[PDB]
Amino acid sequence: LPEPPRFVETQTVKQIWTSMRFASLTESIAVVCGNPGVGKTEAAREYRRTNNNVWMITITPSCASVLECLTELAFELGMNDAPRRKGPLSRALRRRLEGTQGLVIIDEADHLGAEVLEELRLLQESTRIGLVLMGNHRVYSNMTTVEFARLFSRIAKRTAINKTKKADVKAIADAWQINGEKELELLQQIAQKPGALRILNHSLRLAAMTAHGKGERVNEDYLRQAFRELDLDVD
């Protein structure tokens, strides 16, 4: 019956915002490698929505060149007059982006070319801004250090989020007005399976729409039917 809230502040959200503002004021590189679907991507957008001098792209592996990725960052900076060459684009980024005290957020940092991440790290360095890397744990695996040596020397605050915590789903249940202890344990058990935040959010939205269509309150059995869907135990 109430409006579903899309985003909730969580212990991971608190941690990752402190890491984000750390790389902001620190003006240095923060790599966030974690298990898939730990909720990092969404929080980054909440940081972008709440804070000034913040930018974010995503990297599809289609846009995984230096040219394409810097073009993406340039259009995110609003310079629609960006040149299609590498060089003058790099110069335009260097003139535009330095002195703003900003924070670049880059998601899926595993698909970075060495020249790609190389130009990014030398950018932020020659720009006095923030760069923050996201994605899975292949990002730190791509460094483990003569090709990534000075970059491993840059690294300010890595934060690994493997899975959720109990206060994480507890604040989730607080935001979704969930009071059952059986409900809380079931939410925790759903959080034990991967795609944690996503599956939990899906399960929450299934139960909310089912209880709204039936005119009832979200309860434990709606959550059981929701989790009984999705083919999680079906190969």
Ligand X SMILES: Nc1ncnc2c1ncn2[C@@H]1O[C@H](COP(=O)(O)OP(=O)(O)O)[C@@H](O)[C@H]1O
Choose the stretch contacting its own copies; rule: CB under 8 A; options: 16-24, 147-155, 199-207, 224-232.
147-155
Q: Does 30 bind ligand X (CB under 6 A)?
A: no
Query: Closer to ligand X at the Cβ: 23 or 89?
Result: 23
Among the residues of 77-180, which ranges form H helices?
A: 86-97, 114-125, 138-141, 149-154, 166-175
CB 110 within 8 A of CB 60: no
Q: Which two tokens stand for residue 64?
A: 């995984």
Q: Is 36 annotated as a binding residue?
A: yes
Helix and strand tally (H, E) in the chain? 11, 4
Distance CA 115, CA 33 (A): 20
Q: Does 52 bind its own copies (CB under 8 A)?
A: no
40 binds, among ligand X, its own copies, none (CB under 5 to 8 A by kind): ligand X
- Applying CB under 8 A, among 145, 162, 177, 192 the residue interacting with its own copies is 145
- Class of residue 217 by CB neighbours under 10 A (exposed 0-12, middle 13-18, buried 19+): exposed
Distance CA 43, CA 129 (A): 20
- Applying CB under 8 A, among 146, 181, 234, 235 the residue interacting with its own copies is 146
Query: Closer to its own copies at the Cβ: 146 or 234?
Result: 146
Tell the smallest beta-carbon distance from residue 86 to ligand X (Å): 28
Beta strands in the chain, from DSSP E residues, in sequence order: 29-31, 54-58, 103-107, 130-133
> Contacts with ligand X in 167-226 (CB under 6 A)?
197-198, 201
Positive or negative: CA dihedral 18, 24, 29, 34: positive
Q: Is 12 annotated as a binding residue?
A: no
Choose the stretch contacting ligand X; rule: CB under 6 A; options: 6-14, 51-59, 111-119, 181-189.
6-14
Choose the stretch contacting its own copies; rule: CB under 8 A; options: 43-51, 85-93, 141-149, 181-189.
141-149
Q: Which two tokens stand for residue 190?
A: 């759903």
Q: Does 40 bind ligand X (CB under 6 A)?
A: yes
Q: Which residues bind ligand X (CB under 6 A)?
A: 7-8, 10, 13, 36-43, 197-198, 201
Q: Which residues bind its own copies (CB under 8 A)?
A: 144-149
Known binding residues for ATP are 34-41
